[PDB]
Structure formats: structure tokens, C-alpha cells
Design a protein around this nucleic acid. Structure first.
Lengths: 88, 104, 126, 66, 50
RNA sequence: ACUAACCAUCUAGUAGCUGGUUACCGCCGAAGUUUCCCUCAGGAUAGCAGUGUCGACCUUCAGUUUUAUGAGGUAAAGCGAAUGAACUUUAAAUAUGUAAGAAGCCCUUGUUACUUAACUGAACGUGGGCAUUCGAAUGUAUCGACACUAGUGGGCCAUUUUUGGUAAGCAGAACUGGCGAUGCGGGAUGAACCGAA
RNA sequence: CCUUUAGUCCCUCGAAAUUUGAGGCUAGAGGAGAAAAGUUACCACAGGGAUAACUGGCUUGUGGCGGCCAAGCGUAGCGACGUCGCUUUUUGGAUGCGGCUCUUCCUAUCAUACCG
């Protein structure tokens, strides 16, 4: 068994998009997670796979909803930053 | 050297017994021709193995750091030497003593 | 030095440059070239098997190879025989075109006058 | 596969060559200390203690300072 | 017996033991015989021997 | 909702592993190895042995010596030659590569799409020269090419050369020899010793 | 950009007074690039190669190291017996397969015999 990262395996486009891939052996631009909201969304996802299986449907719905709200707040703050740096 | 030290995981399983540990050596000053018992400060180079010089193994022809304070050696600036190089020149594994000649 | 294809070259192996280092077995060897490159030269060499002989190929660059002149001596002999043959035919006399294996020496007498032999002891003491 | 075939073919020669290289290393280390001893006997200009840096670099720095 | 002596014996036609032959004294033949020194006894024959 | 035992047969199931595998005499007779591919219960090429066909005739050939010339200038003599293993007129011992003919060397001028300031050079051809020692010795139990076929792919010991190491052992490379498939005499006896097949 | 090396005792800053430290100069040495790269007599796991037992005129009562002396070998180096220095001095538990019976042998003898 050898890792798909070690093997030069091209990325394949599926229902999960590949997106704009980065050239190999070049500068993969570092995006930094230092915002309280971005830490919130990453933390919410991490706690989701850590807790895992829940019998209660409403509890599962609330877990998904808190992840969704974290993403919504992150997107809002990033759009606000975009507007701030584009106007002022 | 020390007694209750915690070794890195790199060396944690190397066991060095009390019966084999040595703390003083018979060090000979050639020009001031005299042999005295002096404490060992550190192990600088075992010419047989880097692992041995890391572990402090004392073999023939091995450079060690020795406290030469009792000799009262005056340096060029006028100070008394507190540490010099000494070569182990015997087989401490066959002789229950450590014998060194001071490189001065 | 310019080396063509088909000539015979001796290998010296100097220690000045480590590039293109040949083995001690190929050191001090004589062979024929088959490939010529910008710097290296392909030489056909004869290697000794534990019971036979085989032909190997080595890559040695310019600074180790030099020309030989065994064939120069052979051509000198051919010219020398041709010239003696023509001269002998012109003069109507026979000559030896062969070469001799250095036969033993003939009888002679050596005089003692002014050359009195000196007696020697087994060891020289003085 | 090809790399491991070469490893099995050359396994023992590597071992003997490494033994020889270690012997050469021991000879070189003993030589450098002998040079240090000879230079100290001839002359030398030090401080109270020895240099805190590694011994190999310490010895070289002395044998180059002269 | 080494191969060089083995070849020199073959060329001097000394295939068996007690296997004498006649040789013309010369530099090349003398060197061959001197190399094959450890196995043969040689000398100068006279008229009666011949 | 989901997914034991014995009898006969398929079955003479599947093995690369074990054991065994049936008269005599004669002739010829090994290998334990190079290289390539690939991760096997390994293949391919070359080698040793043999058969057939084709070409010549000791033609030729050769684990050899000699001559010539390299890598070893290694020892030695001298410095009333110069200079100073690193000096040399000279030059050891010791093994070792190559060459020694018609399968030759040249010289001469016709062509070429190559090349050159140019019929000028190189290649392709012509003429000549030696057929009697045709261009060292000794041997020669022939040699070469193509095609095909079988058994082999292990090593142990010792001499010499050499690398390293130990307190001493010892470890590793090159050649050669012995033993494998070898009887016999000798060493009281015997894998490794001596003589000799 | 700092650090080291040798030099003129050539210049600035700081300190102390009857001298220093840090810089400055001459020219050697150290530090395609945020993707990752190099390296280790080290550890863990997995795998490969070599080696596969081992001692067998072996073993016993007198240490090792450095100096001095040292017949010689040699024409600097090897070097015994001693002596000096360290261990080492001016007042008196260790151990982590065992045990018992019988035969015979060894002497490196505890007793008995005889001796100095």
C-alpha cells in the first residue's frame, strides 16, 4: 500500500469539484485561519465528526444547523472584509 | 555526571550500570611530571563510535575533559586552568581504573 | 592530442583528475578504440578470465590515453627488409631478411698481460 | 524490485567497505589528536576552560589558528 | 604445475616422464628451459650419447 | 427479515515435497561459469560436451619464449658525471598489455555528390615491388563459420600478491594449485601432506 | 547584516584616566528560495544480505598508565628487572538452578607420618 500523495495521481472531477488545482512543485499559497469565525466553523466540523452518531433527529439537525450558521457568519464576515478593502 | 537524569527516547533503553560508571581518572601531567587523581568533567570524543561518545563510553585513546584546578597551572593571561583535555591511554574495560595523559 | 578510430592507445591512469577513473585492472593497459566522444574515448580491451580471455569495453578520456609505436617498429622492419631486398637484388648478392634469436657465443682467447687477475675473498673486508 | 536486486547482489561488499571506512575514520581521528598533542607539546595560549564548541571543530580551529 | 610450465612442456614435446628431447641452444629456447627448470634435467650431450 | 458422525461417488482431485524407478560391454565425456530480463517454486545469451553441413589444409594456430614498445624507475652504482622514493649516465628482481606480413606496406594518378585558395587532401580504383628465407623461435593430436541437441548454474582448502584489524584470533580482494567424477605407492592411522595418474 | 582570521598601530563612538571595548579599511572563511530539500554508526515497524555454534598443547600467583635507568637491535624508534607518581592513609555483607547418596580417579594436603 502506497499513498495517493506519494504516487503522482491526477485529481479527478466528480460530484465533489476539483476546483482550480495548483501546479506541482510550486508555491501553494498559504491561506491563514486566524479569524474567530473561521476557527468556529473548523471547530464545529471537528466536533461533528468527533461526536458522530446521534439517535435524536432534532439533535442531528441542530448539529448540522450550527455548522451551517458558522459557515454563514464566515461568509458574511469575508464579504464585509472584501467590501471594506474595495471601497476604503 | 548527574544521577537522576531523564534520557531522550533516542537513548532511553541504553542501560549503563553503577558497577561500570567511573568518576575520577589518574591523569598524568608530562612536563610537570606527576600523576594525580582528578574528576572527569565530560566526554569529548571516543574515536571508535559517535554513539559511544554520546553515551560516555571510556575506551583506549579517548579524549575527555578533566578538572585540572588542583594542579595550579598558570595560563598565558595569568589564570588557573579549570579544565583541560586528557586522552585515556589504557583499556578501562580490562583494568579497573581509568588512566589519562594530559594534552598540554 | 587527436585520436582517430582504429589506432592503438596505451592507458597511463594519472591521479590528477578523478573524473573517468578506471579500475586498477584497466590501469597500465593497451587496447584499440571503437568510439570517440567529445572528451571520453571508447576503448576495446582484453580482460583475463580465471580460465579464458574476453573482450570488454571501457570509457577513458583523453588525459590517460597516448599513442603506441609497436606498429611503428613493425613498419620500420617492413621498410628495412624492402630496402635491403632491393639493394641485394641490384648488387646481385644474398642477404638475411630474417632476424636472429641471438645464438650462443664463439671461442676466443683473453690475455693476462697488463690485466693480472685479482684474488677475492668471500666477503669484502677493509 | 531492481533496486532490491542490486542490494542483494552487492550486500556483502557494502558491509566490508563500511568496515574499512570506519577503520579509516578511526585512524583519522587518532591522527588529528596526535597532531593536537604534538602541537601542544611544541607550544600553546589557552584560557581557563576548553572551547565549548564540538571537539572536531574545536580541534580544527586550534590547528588552523596555529 | 602452473599453466606457463604446462605450455612449455607441451612445446618441448615432453608429454610423459623420462621423456628426453634434443634442443638447439639459443636465447629463446634457453629462456623456455630456464622457466621449466623445476621439472626437467638438461645438459650437453656428447657423441656417444647422441 | 438475512446468512457433528459414517457410506458410496465426483476422485487415479490438487505437490514444486518424500520414497523408489528393472541386463552387459565398448566409445565419447562435462560443468559448476560471463552477460541480460524479471521478483521466483525462474527464463534468455554465451561457455564446457556432442551431431550435421559448408571452406581451406598445419592453411592455420598457441595460458610459451625472443625482438620491439607501454604501465610499473622498483632495487642498485656514482655524486674524482650535473643537480639534490621525491638526484641521475646507466639500470636491477618480479610478474604484465600490445605488434611480429600477401588477411602486407607504401609510393603513382582517374572519379566522387566529401573537402580545399587549387588536381589540392580523404574514400573508391589502376601500376609496381617480394611466390625460393613470404620477412623471430618451438610445437601443431587441424582450424573457422552456420544450424541443432543434452547435463550444468554449488563451493571447501592451500601458495603468492595485497587491504584493514586485534592482546591474540581474524575479515576481504587477485592469480594459481588440489578436491569434486580418481584408482595406486608412501606419511603407523586419516577430506586438504609427499610421489605418481 | 552581523562573526572570525593577519596587518598599518590608519579613523569614529563608549569607558577609565596614565589604558580598554565596539565598530571603520585591505582579502579568505559562515549563514530559483515557503514548494520543500539535505542529514544521522539514534528509535519503532516491515523487509533484505551475510553469519550459524563454540573451545579445543585452551587454563593457574603476582594491576594498569607516565617518568628515570636500561644489555642490546638499530644508526631517531622497540626495550626487561627495578624505582618514583596515581589508586594510597600522621593514631586499630556479596550473591538472584539447588540439594542428597554411591563408584572411581587427581593433588592444587584440612588431618594423620617424616623433615627445613
Amino acid at each position: 500500500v502506497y499513498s495517493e500523495k506519494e504516487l503522482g495521481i491526477p485529481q479527478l472531477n466528480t460530484v465533489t469539484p476539483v476546483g482550480v488545482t495548483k501546479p506541482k512543485g510550486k508555491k501553494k499559497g498559504k491561506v491563514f485561519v486566524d479569524d474567530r469565525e473561521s476557527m468556529n466553523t473548523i471547530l464545529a466540523m471537528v466536533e461533528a465528526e468527533k461526536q458522530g452518531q446521534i439517535e435524536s433527529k432534532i439533535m442531528r439537525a441542530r448539529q448540522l444547523e450550527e455548522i451551517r450558521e458558522a459557515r454563514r457568519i464566515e461568509a458574511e464576515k469575508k464579504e464585509a472584509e472584501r467590501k471594506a478593502l474595495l471601497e476604503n | 555526571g548527574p544521577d537522576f537524569t531523564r534520557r531522550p527516547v533516542k537513548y532511553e533503553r541504553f542501560i549503563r550500570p553503577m558497577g561500570l560508571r567511573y568518576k575520577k581518572a589518574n591523569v598524568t601531567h608530562p612536563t610537570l611530571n606527576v600523576t594525580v587523581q582528578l574528576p572527569i568533567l565530560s566526554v569529548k570524543k571516543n574515536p571508535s563510535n559517535p554513539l559511544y561518545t554520546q553515551l560516555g563510553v571510556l575506551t583506549k585513546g579517548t579524549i575527555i575533559e578533566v578538572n585540572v584546578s588542583d594542579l595550579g597551572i598558570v595560563t598565558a593571561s595569568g589564570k588557573i586552568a579549570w579544565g583541560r583535555y586528557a586522552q585515556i591511554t589504557n583499556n578501562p574495560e580490562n583494568d579497573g581504573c581509568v588512566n589519562a595523559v594530559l594534552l598540554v | 592530442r587527436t585520436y582517430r578510430v582504429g589506432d592503438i592507445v596505451d592507458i597511463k591512469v594519472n591521479g590528477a583528475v578523478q573524473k573517468g577513473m578506471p579500475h586498477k585492472f584497466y590501469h597500465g593497459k593497451t587496447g584499440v578504440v571503437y568510439n570517440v566522444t567529445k572528451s571520453a574515448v571508447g576503448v576495446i580491451v582484453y580482460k583475463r578470465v580465471k580460465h579464458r580471455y574476453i573482450e570488454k569495453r571501457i570509457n577513458v578520456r583523453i588525459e590517460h590515453v597516448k599513442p603506441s609505436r609497436s606498429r611503428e617498429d613493425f613498419l620500420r622492419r617492413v621498410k628495412e627488409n624492402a630496402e635491403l631486398k632491393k639493394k641485394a637484388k641490384a648488387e646481385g648478392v644474398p642477404v638475411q631478411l630474417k632476424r636472429q634469436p641471438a645464438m650462443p657465443r664463439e671461442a676466443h682467447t683473453v690475455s693476462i698481460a697488463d690485466n693480472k687477475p685479482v684474488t677475492l675473498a668471500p666477503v669484502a673486508y677493509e | 524490485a531492481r533496486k532490491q536486486r542490486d542490494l542483494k547482489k552487492f550486500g556483502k561488499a557494502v558491509q566490508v567497505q563500511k568496515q574499512l571506512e570506519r577503520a579509516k575514520q578511526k585512524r583519522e581521528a587518532l591522527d588529528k589528536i596526535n597532531q593536537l598533542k604534538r602541537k601542544r607539546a611544541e607550544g600553546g595560549a589557552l584560557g581557563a576552560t576548553e572551547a565549548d564548541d564540538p571537539f572536531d571543530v574545536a580541534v580544527d580551529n586550534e590547528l588552523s589558528r596555529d | 604445475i602452473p599453466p606457463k610450465p604446462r605450455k612449455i612442456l607441451q612445446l618441448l614435446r615432453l608429454r610423459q616422464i623420462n621423456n628426453g628431447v634434443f634442443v638447439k641452444v639459443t636465447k629463446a629456447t634457453a629462456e623456455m628451459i630456464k622457466i621449466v627448470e623445476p621439472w626437467v634435467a638438461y645438459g650437453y650431450p656428447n657423441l656417444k650419447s647422441v
